[PDB]
Amino acid sequence: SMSPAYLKEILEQLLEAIVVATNPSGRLISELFQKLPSKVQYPDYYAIIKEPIDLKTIAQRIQNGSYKSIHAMAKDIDLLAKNAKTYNEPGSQVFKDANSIKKIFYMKKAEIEHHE
Ligand SMILES: [Cl-]
Ligand SMILES: [Cl-]
Ligand SMILES: [Zn+2]
Ligand SMILES: [Zn+2]
């Protein structure tokens, strides 16, 4: 049973891996995932997406100690990606970036959990 302090460091490392990741273009994969869209300008989004989430919210949850396991953060990352892949058309760059974020997260998780 790792301490809350140890868990936090792990979660921070996972988030960092996501937010520093770049595409071949050099663009940050995380760019369009930092902040949810305006409720005023994009009301359709909130009618369609039942549980909105963004990277800012996930970061806040890490700081709040809201997550009691790496799994809980992982489920939020899954949701982050699922929502983008629900509201946005497949093949789109946002769709691709959603998957890339998951790939980065789970690769980093494995690196951390399996290193010996
Ligand atoms: Cl495993
Ligand atoms: Cl494992
Ligand atoms: Zn394992
Ligand atoms: Zn090692």
Side-chain angles (χ1 to χ4, degrees), residues 2-26 28-116:
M2 73 192 62
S3 71
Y6 185 64
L7 172 59
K8 181 178 185 184
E9 293 308 308
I10 299 307
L11 303 185
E12 285 176 302
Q13 288 165 24
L14 290 165
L15 178 64
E16 180 71 2
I18 291 171
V19 301
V20 306
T22 56
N23 279 330
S25 61
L28 293 172
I29 299 175
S30 63
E31 182 183 2
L32 301 188
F33 295 81
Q34 286 283 3
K35 186 72 189 181
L36 284 169
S38 171
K39 289 188 177 187
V40 174
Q41 299 298 330
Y42 300 94
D44 283 25
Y45 186 94
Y46 293 89
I48 296 161
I49 302 300
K50 295 313 179 178
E51 293 181 287
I53 196 174
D54 53 24
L55 290 171
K56 283 181 184 299
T57 297
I58 292 161
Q60 290 180 336
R61 287 165 182 177
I62 294 172
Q63 290 301 320
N64 293 343
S66 292
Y67 299 124
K68 316 301 186 179
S69 63
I70 302 170
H71 172 91
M73 179 183 176
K75 295 288 285 185
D76 272 358
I77 295 295
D78 287 358
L79 177 62
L80 176 79
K82 182 183 176 73
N83 290 345
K85 293 162 60 180
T86 294
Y87 186 80
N88 300 283
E89 299 155 357
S92 71
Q93 228 295 109
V94 175
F95 193 99
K96 292 173 63 171
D97 285 352
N99 276 337
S100 293
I101 287 172
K102 285 183 71 169
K103 281 183 166 184
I104 292 296
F105 175 87
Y106 289 111
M107 178 74 158
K108 185 67 172 184
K109 182 175 186 285
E111 291 175 342
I112 289 172
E113 293 187 314
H114 289 174
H115 217 277
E116 51 173 306

